[PDB]
Swiss-Prot record, chain A:
Keyword vocabulary terms for this entry: Cytoplasm, Metal-binding, Ribonucleoprotein, Ribosomal protein, RNA-binding, rRNA-binding, Zinc, Zinc-finger
Any single GO CC term annotated in Swiss-Prot or TrEMBL for this entry: cytosolic large ribosomal subunit
InterPro entries to which the protein is assigned, alphabetical: Ribosomal_eL37 (IPR001569), Ribosomal_eL37/eL43 (IPR011331), Ribosomal_eL37_CS (IPR018267), Ribosomal_zn-bd (IPR011332)
Role played: Component of the ribosome, a large ribonucleoprotein complex responsible for the synthesis of proteins in the cell. The small ribosomal subunit (SSU) binds messenger RNAs (mRNAs) and translates the encoded message by selecting cognate aminoacyl-transfer RNA (tRNA) molecules. The large subunit (LSU) contains the ribosomal catalytic site termed the peptidyl transferase center (PTC), which catalyzes the formation of peptide bonds, thereby polymerizing the amino acids delivered by tRNAs into a polypeptide chain.
The protein, known as: Large ribosomal subunit protein eL37A
SUPFAM superfamilies noted in UniProt: Zn-binding ribosomal proteins (SSF57829)
From Swiss-Prot, chain B:
Gene Ontology cellular component list: cytoplasm; cytosol; cytosolic large ribosomal subunit
Domain of life per record: Eukaryota
Summary of the function given for this chain in its UniProt record: Component of the ribosome, a large ribonucleoprotein complex responsible for the synthesis of proteins in the cell. The small ribosomal subunit (SSU) binds messenger RNAs (mRNAs) and translates the encoded message by selecting cognate aminoacyl-transfer RNA (tRNA) molecules. The large subunit (LSU) contains the ribosomal catalytic site termed the peptidyl transferase center (PTC), which catalyzes the formation of peptide bonds, thereby polymerizing the amino acids delivered by tRNAs into a polypeptide chain.
Record InterPro entries: Ribosomal_eL39, Ribosomal_eL39_CS, Ribosomal_eL39_dom_sf
Molecular function as annotated in GO: structural constituent of ribosome
Keywords: Cytoplasm, Ribonucleoprotein, Ribosomal protein
Xref: SUPFAM superfamilies: Ribosomal protein L39e (SSF48662)
This protein's name: Large ribosomal subunit protein eL39
Originating organism: Saccharomyces cerevisiae (strain ATCC 204508 / S288c) (Baker's yeast)
Ranges of Basic residues composition bias in the record: 6-19
Subunit structure: Component of the large ribosomal subunit (LSU). Mature yeast ribosomes consist of a small (40S) and a large (60S) subunit. The 40S small subunit contains 1 molecule of ribosomal RNA (18S rRNA) and 33 different proteins (encoded by 57 genes). The large 60S subunit contains 3 rRNA molecules (25S, 5.8S and 5S rRNA) and 46 different proteins (encoded by 81 genes). eL39 interacts with YIH1.
Coiled coil location: none
Swiss-Prot record, chain C:
SMART domains given in the database record: Ribosomal_L2, Ribosomal_L2_C
Cellular location(s): Cytoplasm
Positions bearing the Glycyl lysine isopeptide (Lys-Gly) (interchain with G-Cter in ubiquitin) cross-link: K45, K92, K118, K144
Other facts: There are 2 genes for uL2 in yeast.
Keyword entries, A-Z: Cytoplasm, Isopeptide bond, Phosphoprotein, Ribonucleoprotein, Ribosomal protein, RNA-binding, rRNA-binding, Ubl conjugation
Quaternary context: Component of the large ribosomal subunit (LSU). Mature yeast ribosomes consist of a small (40S) and a large (60S) subunit. The 40S small subunit contains 1 molecule of ribosomal RNA (18S rRNA) and 33 different proteins (encoded by 57 genes). The large 60S subunit contains 3 rRNA molecules (25S, 5.8S and 5S rRNA) and 46 different proteins (encoded by 81 genes).
Record-linked Gene3D superfamilies: 2.30.30.30, Nucleic acid-binding proteins, Ribosomal protein L2, domain 3
Organism of origin: Saccharomyces cerevisiae (strain ATCC 204508 / S288c)
Phosphoserine: residues bearing it: S51, S94, S158, S159, S248
The protein's name: Large ribosomal subunit protein uL2A
GO BP term, pick one: maintenance of translational fidelity
GO molecular function: RNA binding; rRNA binding; structural constituent of ribosome
One Pfam family per UniProt: Ribosomal_L2_C
From Swiss-Prot, chain D:
Protein name: Large ribosomal subunit protein eL34A
GO-annotated molecular function: structural constituent of ribosome
Family of this protein: Belongs to the eukaryotic ribosomal protein eL34 family.
Compartmental location: Cytoplasm
InterPro entries reported for this sequence: Ribosomal_eL34 (IPR008195), Ribosomal_eL34_C_sf (IPR038562), Ribosomal_eL34_CS (IPR018065)
Organism classification: Eukaryota, Fungi, Dikarya, Ascomycota, Saccharomycotina
Functional summary from the UniProt entry: Component of the ribosome, a large ribonucleoprotein complex responsible for the synthesis of proteins in the cell. The small ribosomal subunit (SSU) binds messenger RNAs (mRNAs) and translates the encoded message by selecting cognate aminoacyl-transfer RNA (tRNA) molecules. The large subunit (LSU) contains the ribosomal catalytic site termed the peptidyl transferase center (PTC), which catalyzes the formation of peptide bonds, thereby polymerizing the amino acids delivered by tRNAs into a polypeptide chain.
Record keywords, A-Z: Cytoplasm, Ribonucleoprotein, Ribosomal protein
Taxonomic superkingdom: Eukaryota
Amino acid sequence: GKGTPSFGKRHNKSHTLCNRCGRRSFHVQKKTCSSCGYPAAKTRSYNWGAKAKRRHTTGTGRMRYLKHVSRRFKNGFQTGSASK
Amino acid sequence: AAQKSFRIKQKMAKAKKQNRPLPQWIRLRTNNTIRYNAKRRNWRRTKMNI
Amino acid sequence: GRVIRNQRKGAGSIFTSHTRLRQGAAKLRTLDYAERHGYIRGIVKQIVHDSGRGAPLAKVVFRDPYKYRLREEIFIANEGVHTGQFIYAGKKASLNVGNVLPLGSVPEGTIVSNVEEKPGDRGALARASGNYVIIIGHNPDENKTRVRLPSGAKKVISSDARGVIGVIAGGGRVDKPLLKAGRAFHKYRLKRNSWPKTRGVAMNPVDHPHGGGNHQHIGKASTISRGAVSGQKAGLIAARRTGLLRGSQKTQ
Amino acid sequence: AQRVTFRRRNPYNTRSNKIKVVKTPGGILRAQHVKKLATRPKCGDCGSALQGISTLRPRQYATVSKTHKTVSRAYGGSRCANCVKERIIRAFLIEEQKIVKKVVKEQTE
RNA sequence: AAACUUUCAACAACGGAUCUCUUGGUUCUCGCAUCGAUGAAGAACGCAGCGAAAUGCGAUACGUAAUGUGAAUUGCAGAAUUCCGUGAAUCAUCGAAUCUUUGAACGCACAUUGCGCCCCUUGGUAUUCCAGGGGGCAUGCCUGUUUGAGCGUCAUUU
RNA sequence: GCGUUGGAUUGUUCACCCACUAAUAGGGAACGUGAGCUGGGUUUAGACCGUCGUGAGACAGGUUAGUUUUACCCUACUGAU
RNA sequence: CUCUUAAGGUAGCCAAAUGCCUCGUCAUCUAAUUAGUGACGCGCAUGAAUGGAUUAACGAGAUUCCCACUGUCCCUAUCUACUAUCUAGCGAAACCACAGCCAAGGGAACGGGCUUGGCAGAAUCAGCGGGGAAAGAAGACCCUGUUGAGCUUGACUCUAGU
RNA sequence: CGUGGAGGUCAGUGACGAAGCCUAGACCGUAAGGUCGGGUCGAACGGCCUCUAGUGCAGAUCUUGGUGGUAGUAGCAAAUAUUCAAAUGAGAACUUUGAAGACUGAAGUGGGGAAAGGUUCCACGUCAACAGCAGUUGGACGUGGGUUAGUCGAUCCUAAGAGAUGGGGAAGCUCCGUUUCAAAGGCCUGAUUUUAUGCAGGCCACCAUCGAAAGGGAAUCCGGUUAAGAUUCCGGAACCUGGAUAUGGAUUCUUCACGGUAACGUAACUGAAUGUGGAGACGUCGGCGCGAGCCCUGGGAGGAGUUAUCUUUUCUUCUUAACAGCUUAUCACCCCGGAAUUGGUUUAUCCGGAGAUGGGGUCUUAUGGCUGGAAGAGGCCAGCACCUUUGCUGGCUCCGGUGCGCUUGUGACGGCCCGUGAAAAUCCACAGGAAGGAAUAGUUUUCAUGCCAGGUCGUACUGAUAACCGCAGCAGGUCUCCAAGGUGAACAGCCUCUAGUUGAUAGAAUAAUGUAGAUAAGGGAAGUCGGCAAAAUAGAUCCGUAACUUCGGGAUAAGGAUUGGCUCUAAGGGUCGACGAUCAACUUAGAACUGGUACGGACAAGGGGAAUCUGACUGUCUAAUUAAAACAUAGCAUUGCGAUGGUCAGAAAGUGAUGUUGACGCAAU
RNA sequence: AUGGUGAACUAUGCCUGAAUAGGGUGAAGCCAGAGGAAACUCUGGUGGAGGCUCGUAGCGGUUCUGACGUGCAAAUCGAUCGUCGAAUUUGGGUAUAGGGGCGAAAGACUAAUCGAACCAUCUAGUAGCUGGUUCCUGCCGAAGUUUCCCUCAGGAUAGCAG
RNA sequence: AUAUUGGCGAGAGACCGAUAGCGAACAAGUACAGUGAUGGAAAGAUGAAAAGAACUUUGAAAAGAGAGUGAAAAAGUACGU
Ligand SMILES: [K+]
Ligand SMILES: [K+]
Ligand SMILES: [K+]
Ligand SMILES: [K+]
Ligand SMILES: [K+]
Ligand SMILES: [Mg+2]
Ligand SMILES: [Mg+2]
Ligand SMILES: [Mg+2]
Ligand SMILES: [Mg+2]
Ligand SMILES: [Mg+2]
Ligand SMILES: [Mg+2]
Ligand SMILES: [Mg+2]
Ligand SMILES: [Mg+2]
Ligand SMILES: [Mg+2]
Ligand SMILES: [Mg+2]
Ligand SMILES: [Mg+2]
Ligand SMILES: [Mg+2]
Ligand SMILES: [Mg+2]
Ligand SMILES: [Mg+2]
Ligand SMILES: [Mg+2]
Ligand SMILES: [Mg+2]
Ligand SMILES: [Mg+2]
Ligand SMILES: [Mg+2]
Ligand SMILES: [Mg+2]
Ligand SMILES: [Mg+2]
Ligand SMILES: [Mg+2]
Ligand SMILES: [Mg+2]
Ligand SMILES: [Mg+2]
Ligand SMILES: [Mg+2]
Ligand SMILES: [Mg+2]
Ligand SMILES: [Mg+2]
Ligand SMILES: [Mg+2]
Ligand SMILES: [Mg+2]
Ligand SMILES: [Mg+2]
Ligand SMILES: [Mg+2]
Ligand SMILES: [Mg+2]
Ligand SMILES: [Mg+2]
Ligand SMILES: [Mg+2]
Ligand SMILES: [Mg+2]
Ligand SMILES: [Mg+2]
Ligand SMILES: [Mg+2]
Ligand SMILES: [Mg+2]
Ligand SMILES: [Mg+2]
Ligand SMILES: [Mg+2]
Ligand SMILES: [Mg+2]
Ligand SMILES: [Mg+2]
Ligand SMILES: [Mg+2]
Ligand SMILES: [Mg+2]
Ligand SMILES: [Mg+2]
Ligand SMILES: [Mg+2]
Ligand SMILES: [Mg+2]
Ligand SMILES: [Mg+2]
Ligand SMILES: [Mg+2]
Ligand SMILES: [Mg+2]
Ligand SMILES: [Mg+2]
Ligand SMILES: [Mg+2]
Ligand SMILES: [Mg+2]
Ligand SMILES: [Mg+2]
Ligand SMILES: [Mg+2]
Ligand SMILES: [Mg+2]
Ligand SMILES: [Mg+2]
Ligand SMILES: [Mg+2]
Ligand SMILES: [Mg+2]
Ligand SMILES: [Mg+2]
Ligand SMILES: [Mg+2]
Ligand SMILES: [Mg+2]
Ligand SMILES: [Mg+2]
Ligand SMILES: [Mg+2]
Ligand SMILES: [Mg+2]
Ligand SMILES: [Mg+2]
Ligand SMILES: [Mg+2]
Ligand SMILES: [Mg+2]
Ligand SMILES: [Mg+2]
Ligand SMILES: [Mg+2]
Ligand SMILES: [Mg+2]
Ligand SMILES: [Mg+2]
Ligand SMILES: [Mg+2]
Ligand SMILES: [Mg+2]
Ligand SMILES: [Mg+2]
Ligand SMILES: [Mg+2]
Ligand SMILES: [Mg+2]
Ligand SMILES: [Mg+2]
Ligand SMILES: [Mg+2]
Ligand SMILES: [Mg+2]
Ligand SMILES: [Mg+2]
Ligand SMILES: [Mg+2]
Ligand SMILES: [Mg+2]
Ligand SMILES: [Mg+2]
Ligand SMILES: [Mg+2]
Ligand SMILES: [Mg+2]
Ligand SMILES: [Mg+2]
Ligand SMILES: [Mg+2]
Ligand SMILES: [Mg+2]
Ligand SMILES: [Mg+2]
Ligand SMILES: [Mg+2]
Ligand SMILES: [Mg+2]
Ligand SMILES: [Mg+2]
Ligand SMILES: [Mg+2]
Ligand SMILES: [Mg+2]
Ligand SMILES: [Mg+2]
Ligand SMILES: [Mg+2]
Ligand SMILES: [Zn+2]
Ligand SMILES: [Zn+2]
C-alpha cells in the first residue's frame, strides 16, 4: 500500500471554497483559509511570499473605484457639472 | 454528489456555460490573433477542483 | 531526542478522560444553612453504575429549602444504601449508614466515606470502591478531627468537613483477576488512553531514557531524583527505597 | 424474486432507515420506509407501562384527543393505578401518624 | 550486376536556426501625492443581436447621465445617413447616477444562496399568522442627550 | 586417447566416514561459470543471548527473519534462408 | 593452607538461540551424522522479576527423526491453453565516443582498434546467454574532508524547568 | 582574426535586390579568417580610423528545443467466446437488428444509493483528433433538451468537539477560557389606556453561536406519464404544521361530563404560574414465539411450450398502497377466591399468603382480519376496425395448504461485563388551583365538519475491469441496501431463472525456451541448506483413541469400517369426537435386491506421529525485502502522591491534561 | 535558520453509524433417575458459555523466495496461507502538527516524502573536493624541491618561468 | 535641502531583440500541477491589400490535378527567411 491502492481512498476534501478569495483553500475543520487567512480581518501575506503577494495584490482585479481615484485627483475632486 | 450546495451548483453552471468552442465570427475580426478557445475544459481531462 | 510518552500525556489531546457515559460529578450537597445547623432529608431514587468508576452512585433527591422544586444529588453509594432509603445530611443527622455528618459530630472509630478535605468542597477522600476514612480522634479546641485515610496516612481535617457514614460500595473489586487483555481494554476504554503500555526499555533511545542498547536494559539507576526535569522522570521517581518490601509499614 | 431499493437517499441500514416490503396494487414489490416504533408511556413511580394510554412517537401525542393520553384517576397518564393507591395509603397513614405524634409530644410535657 | 551501406549535390521533407523586424522588457532621470465604514483592495456570479476569453460593466450590467468633438461602428446582422444636427461613435472627457452577492464587512450565521428582530406600508377578516415592497438592528472609543444604579455621598423634610 | 562415482553430517571450500568401482588423480579457464540458477553462508535495516561498554553501542562470537532486475542491439555460438 | 572481596555465582541449568578450544566426551539415532536427542561439566563468557528452572494448550516461529506420500531426484518423457513464431493494423523504451572476428605481444600489468600473425564475400531469420571488464545508480563497504546528521555520556559551553 | 553595440569617415552597398541561407565552383592568408561566382531571398548592410562589451564552444551525467539508430523492433497473450445473416455505410471482425452459442449465477457482470465527479444523462448531427486494431459506434466532436416537493433531504437539535462575548495574558500577529470574579433578561400584565406604555403591580436566568445529507426529527401513498424528471409532474386518495374561524355536537338549574367494585371506558368533557413525570433514549449474543415479503405447493379461470411416444403435463397471470373505521395480541393489571397431597409453567426454572392455579374482566394495537381507499387501478386474455389520432368491445382477475425454510421486523425471556452500552431540540401527561365562567341563557377550537398558506437550496446521471482517486478508458483502491431454483450444513463450490453482458486488437500456424494447468513404469527424498514445490489426507455415520495435562484439554489424537441406486420395514406428530375420524413434514434406524466392488463418483474437502529450542495463550508492528523468539497481554513487583499534591502541559495567564478523578485512585517503571 | 501548509494516506484517542454463512466442542444454571447412615456421590437429559474451534463474507499477508519485474500495478497478480464475534472490521464527524504529533515500539507512521514532513525565503548558503572553462599564429618556457602551517588532496615561502 | 525596486504622469539609453529582455511582447500570474502553503509554462512575423484560390476535373471524403489571385503560392493561414 501507501501508493496506488492508498490513493484510492481520497474522497474527502480537506479544503473547500473560501468565501473571501474563492481559491478552495478554506480548511473545513480549521475553518480558516490557507491562502488569504479568512476569517481573520487581515489578508494573509508574507514577505517571503513575494510571488504570492504579486498574485493577489492591488491591480490584479478591476480596482473598480481606485482606477478612477487618479482621474478624480487630476480634476481636483470637483463636484458640480460640466455646464455646457 | 447529487446533494450539492448552491455554491457548487453555481460554479458548475458557470463551467457548463463556458464549455464551448470559440465563436466562429471571431477569427473574422480585423486583427484577431485569437485562433481557438485555449481555456476549454473537459470532465475527462482536467478536474475543476471545485 | 524526542518528547516521551509521559510528557505527551500533559497536553491532553488523546489522553483526556472518556466522560461521555458518566452520570455526573459525584458530590455531596452544597454545604448550606440546613446542613450547617440541622439536617435535611433526601430519598435515594436510584443506585446506578457509573462508567469508568468501580463504586456505584446513588441519586439522592432533596427538597429545595428556598424554592419549591427538587434537587437531585449524585452521591457515591455506601454499602447497604438502598433505593427508597431516607438519607439525612447535616449537623443533627443520626449516626446511620448513608447519612452525611460533620466529622466532629461522629464518635471516635466511626467509618465515613466521601470525606471533605475542607468544609464545603463536597467530597475528596475515600471515594473509590471499598475505601473508607476512620475517625481516630477529635481536637475540640482548635476544632479538628484526626482521621486515618485509605493509604494509611493520618490527616487533620476541620471538624466541619462532612463525610458519609459507611464504606464505599463495590469493595473487593480488585480481588478478581482481569484474566484478559480484552478485559483490561474494556476497563480503560471508559477511563482514559493509558493502556496498553510499551516498556521504555523496548523502545529506541530517542523515545525514552530506557531505550536502546544491544540488550534491553535500563543502563543507569531507575531511581530518578525528585529534582529531575520532564523527560527524565521515567522509572521510580524519588524512590526512598527499592526491592521487595520486607517487614512492616506505618513508620513513626 | 423482485428486489427492492431504498426510497430515500440514505443507503445505510440505520435506525431511521428501516424498510418493510409491500406489494402494491401494481402487482410489484416495493420498499416502504417504516417509522421507529413507539414506546409505551411509563409510570413515574415504578417504571411499568401505563395502562390505557396510547403509545405514539412524542409529537404524535399533540395530534390526539385527551382521552388517548390520560386515565380518569388522580394521576391520569402519569402514575399507574397501584402506585397511586400506594400514594393514597401512604399520605393518609402518615398524616394520621403526624397527628398522633403531635398529640404524644403535647402530652409528654 | 542489383539490393543494401556510406559520401556529395539538386529537388522534396523534418525542424524552426539564421537574418531582418518589435504596440514588450530593463535601466536612468524628471514631476506629482490621490485607497477604505460616503464600504477599499480582493473575490464570486452575472451583463452584448450573434462572446469562450481578455477588456469593460452591475438587474440602469461591453453600460445610464453630463460635457467635448462632429459622422460614425464594422466580423456579420441591424439601424442610420435629419445626419446645416441638443448629434454617430467599441470616440474622447467625466463633475451626476447605477453599482448583484461579497469582502476590514457590520442583525446572527455561512461547507447553509440558513435563521431572526424592529419600523413604515400592501394583500390575505388580521397588532399577534403568512406573504410582497421600502427602511433599519456589529464592536471599541469620544463629545453630548436621556433614563438609571450604588447608605460612595451632601443638603432638606424628618 | 579415455574415464575418474553414489551417499550420511556441514552453507561450506575443506574435512570426515559409509559404499561401489578399473580408478574414485591434482589443477586452470576473471580463486571459469548469479541479465545461467539457487541464496544455505557472508554482508544493510527486525530480534535474542553471552562477554564488553556508565551509555549510545561493539564483537573473524553464537542464533532466527530478511525483494537476486533488463537482452529485442553487436559479436560469438547453435541452427535457418 | 594460604592470598583475597562489597559479596566471591546460591537454588537451579548447560557445548543450550549463551562453550573459544570444538565437529568437546560418552550414549542413542544411521551403512555412514560438523545435524537431532539424552547425559557429563573448573561453565572463554550459564544463573535467578537485567528474572532462574519448568510447563498443559496454543504457533504461516527455529529444528531432528519416523509413517504416509509423491517427477525433489535416478531420468527423463508426454499432453493442453496462452505466448513466443508469421501476417494486417498499431507501435514504444533501455542504451549508443566511434564501433563490432580472433591468437599472442606489449601496453594503465585481462584489446574491438595498436604490433605481428590467423584470416576475410552481399543481404539476412529464429534462438542464445561466452563477451561487449553490457545496462540500471557521481560505491551504500574502506579511506580522505579541518563536510554533516541521528543517538549517548560528569566531553566543552550553555539552557527551559526546578 | 572574428561578433553585438558606439563616435568619425568612405557625400560606401542596396528593391536594377541589403542581410541571411545553400553551393566535392574560383581566389587570397601559415592560420584565425577574408573575397568572388551561381542558386534562394526580400530591406537593410558594409570597408577603414577609433570606442565599448552580456564578444568566439565539442565536451560541463551542461540548459532549452529538435532529431536519430535501436525499429516497423519489444510488444498490443489475466478476467472461458464467439459464430451466421441482413441493414447501414465509400469502407464493417468490432455499428444496428435478427438467429445461435456462452457467461455473470442474487456475497451478480442485476436494481439503487453515500463520497467524489459535474452534464459524463437524453436527442439530433457527426468521425480531423481520442477510444495503444478498427469504427459508420462512443463517456469523443458540434448543437440543443433535460433535474418540478408543505410530506424526500438540507434547513432544526445536540455529540466528540469548534468558538465570540465578560475578563485575563501577549511587544504583537493573537492566546486562554465557554459560564467563567459581568449591572449579561424578555414575556407577561393590574393599571396606564395624557399611548395598552415610560413611570408604574407582580412571575421566571448560573447564558452566544457553530458542529451529523448514516445519530435525534411534524407530516404521502398508489396508478399513470418522459427521448431524458418523479414518493417532486398528472389523476385520485391522505396527512402534518401555522393560522383564521362558524356551525353542529358536548357541558351548565348540583356550572367546569358521565359510566365501571376495579383494572379502566368515551366524541367532547375549563385550567395560569410553578413543579414533577414520561416519551425522544439507546449494548451485544443465544434459543423460542409471532408477523411481513420471498421460497415451496393443491384446485380452478386464462395465455404460451412439448407432444414419434409419455407427461390431468412444463412455463407464466391471478395484485391491492399511504391513510381511515371496526376488530385483533404477548406482557401487564383488576374483581372473586384462598392454595401442602404444593400447584402453575418455559426449549431454556421461574412464579405464588407481598395471594398461585382457577373463573370472570381491563389494557397497549407491534401485528394480523374485515370494510372503506378500490377496481374505476394494475395484470392476464379474447373478439373486432385501422390513410391516422388509434379506437374500442367484452371476460377473468378466485379459493386454499405447508414449514428447525430464507430475508427482515418484532415480543417475552436468558447469558455477559472491574465494559452495564449518547445528548439535546421537541412533544405529551400529571400535581396545582390563578383566573374565567350559565338561565328570553352562558361555557367548550385536546369532539366533528368547514376556510387559507406552507418559503429557500438540492433533485439529471455514473458510483466504477471506462463517469471517483491512482499522470490513463490503469487486473489497484473506494462506504452501504435488496437478493430466486437445484445440489449441499451452507451467502462454499458447480449448474440454472429474472436482469445484464457477450467488452478486452485480430487472422494463420503449433519450433525451441517459457507462463499456467496435468500425467507418469520401477524406486520413494537417494534431490536439496532444507520435502522448496507437489503428492498424499479430506465430507458424513459408526467404532476406536496414547503420552502428557493447569483436569478445562490433548482429540478429527493415532487407527479402522461404511457410503450409489432401487424395493421395502420401523419409530418419532397435528386437529377433532381406551379408541375412532381426519390431516401433515422431515429426520433417524434397519432389511432385501442390484452393478465391471461402484458409490462425500464432478464439486467440495485435515496428512499424521515421536521429540527439542522458544514465546504462555487470543492479539500487534517494520504500507513497499524482516510477522519473529520482537511488541502487547493478563499475572507479579517496585515507585511517587492526601489536592496549598504526584505526573505532565503552556511564551504568559484570573491558563491547562489526569480530573465528571481521590489510594480498590491517578501517575512512573 | 525564519515564517508558513498539511491527520483526503497513515498513527492514536473520542463522537455517531454500519458489517460478520454454515459447522465442531459443549461451561454454568435447571430437570429426572440411581446410590449413601451421613457427608455427599454417580447416570441420562436440558441448556448454550468461551478475547474456544473448522470454515465463508471480511480483515491480514506465510510460502512458492511462483507470475510480473521497460509490469495491469512506483507493491499488483495466482496459488498456498493467518484470522474470522470482539484487544474484530469499517464509513463519516472530531482532536493531536514538525524537534512537534502519534506509536500493542519497527525509528514505525505523520498525503509514493521520515534516524525529524511539505512549502517559501535567508540563498547564487560554504566547499582545501569533482566536472567544464569558447579564436589563430609567433617568441620564451616550468615544477612536483626548501622552510613554516590543526599541514599530509590545501596554502604561505624560497626556488624554477615570463 | 534628504529617501523612494510602490502608486500616478512624463522624458530618455553606446541596454535586450522572442531560448534574449520581467515569469509573462500573445485571452500571463494565463493554461496546467498540488489537499494545501505554493509551483507555474509554452506561445510574436502570409501578403501592400484576402486579392484567403471563382470555375473544371478525379476522389465517399480529406485532398490531388488544372484554372486562377498575387510582385512572388520557391508567400496557401501546416503561411517572411
Ligand atoms: K508492557
Ligand atoms: K537502554
Ligand atoms: K385512556
Ligand atoms: K539523520
Ligand atoms: K477469507
Ligand atoms: Mg508515507
Ligand atoms: Mg480532516
Ligand atoms: Mg502493566
Ligand atoms: Mg526495537
Ligand atoms: Mg535520551
Ligand atoms: Mg539517564
Ligand atoms: Mg535488540
Ligand atoms: Mg385508551
Ligand atoms: Mg458596492
Ligand atoms: Mg570466480
Ligand atoms: Mg555471467
Ligand atoms: Mg543475478
Ligand atoms: Mg557465484
Ligand atoms: Mg540467507
Ligand atoms: Mg541484521
Ligand atoms: Mg553492563
Ligand atoms: Mg563484523
Ligand atoms: Mg554452581
Ligand atoms: Mg556449558
Ligand atoms: Mg545437548
Ligand atoms: Mg539427516
Ligand atoms: Mg535477586
Ligand atoms: Mg544474563
Ligand atoms: Mg497468532
Ligand atoms: Mg584477443
Ligand atoms: Mg601480459
Ligand atoms: Mg572495447
Ligand atoms: Mg592486422
Ligand atoms: Mg561479411
Ligand atoms: Mg536471453
Ligand atoms: Mg554476455
Ligand atoms: Mg564517487
Ligand atoms: Mg554517492
Ligand atoms: Mg587536513
Ligand atoms: Mg554535528
Ligand atoms: Mg550586446
Ligand atoms: Mg542577396
Ligand atoms: Mg555542403
Ligand atoms: Mg518586407
Ligand atoms: Mg558570454
Ligand atoms: Mg554544441
Ligand atoms: Mg573543450
Ligand atoms: Mg548531454
Ligand atoms: Mg535533450
Ligand atoms: Mg512483434
Ligand atoms: Mg505479454
Ligand atoms: Mg481473455
Ligand atoms: Mg448482436
Ligand atoms: Mg464460474
Ligand atoms: Mg453459469
Ligand atoms: Mg449517452
Ligand atoms: Mg486506435
Ligand atoms: Mg481510425
Ligand atoms: Mg456531447
Ligand atoms: Mg422529512
Ligand atoms: Mg478562543
Ligand atoms: Mg446546527
Ligand atoms: Mg438522520
Ligand atoms: Mg430516472
Ligand atoms: Mg399531486
Ligand atoms: Mg358525554
Ligand atoms: Mg392470576
Ligand atoms: Mg400499524
Ligand atoms: Mg442483515
Ligand atoms: Mg435520480
Ligand atoms: Mg442512478
Ligand atoms: Mg452498481
Ligand atoms: Mg480518472
Ligand atoms: Mg437440502
Ligand atoms: Mg513414478
Ligand atoms: Mg507406480
Ligand atoms: Mg513407500
Ligand atoms: Mg540427502
Ligand atoms: Mg547430495
Ligand atoms: Mg544437510
Ligand atoms: Mg509445501
Ligand atoms: Mg481421525
Ligand atoms: Mg499430539
Ligand atoms: Mg506468541
Ligand atoms: Mg479465535
Ligand atoms: Mg515490509
Ligand atoms: Mg512479510
Ligand atoms: Mg516480550
Ligand atoms: Mg481521517
Ligand atoms: Mg480459527
Ligand atoms: Mg498476494
Ligand atoms: Mg518472487
Ligand atoms: Mg520479463
Ligand atoms: Mg534498530
Ligand atoms: Mg557560483
Ligand atoms: Mg625553447
Ligand atoms: Mg598550530
Ligand atoms: Mg584530484
Ligand atoms: Mg521570454
Ligand atoms: Mg516564424
Ligand atoms: Mg519572393
Ligand atoms: Zn481565502
Ligand atoms: Zn407505577
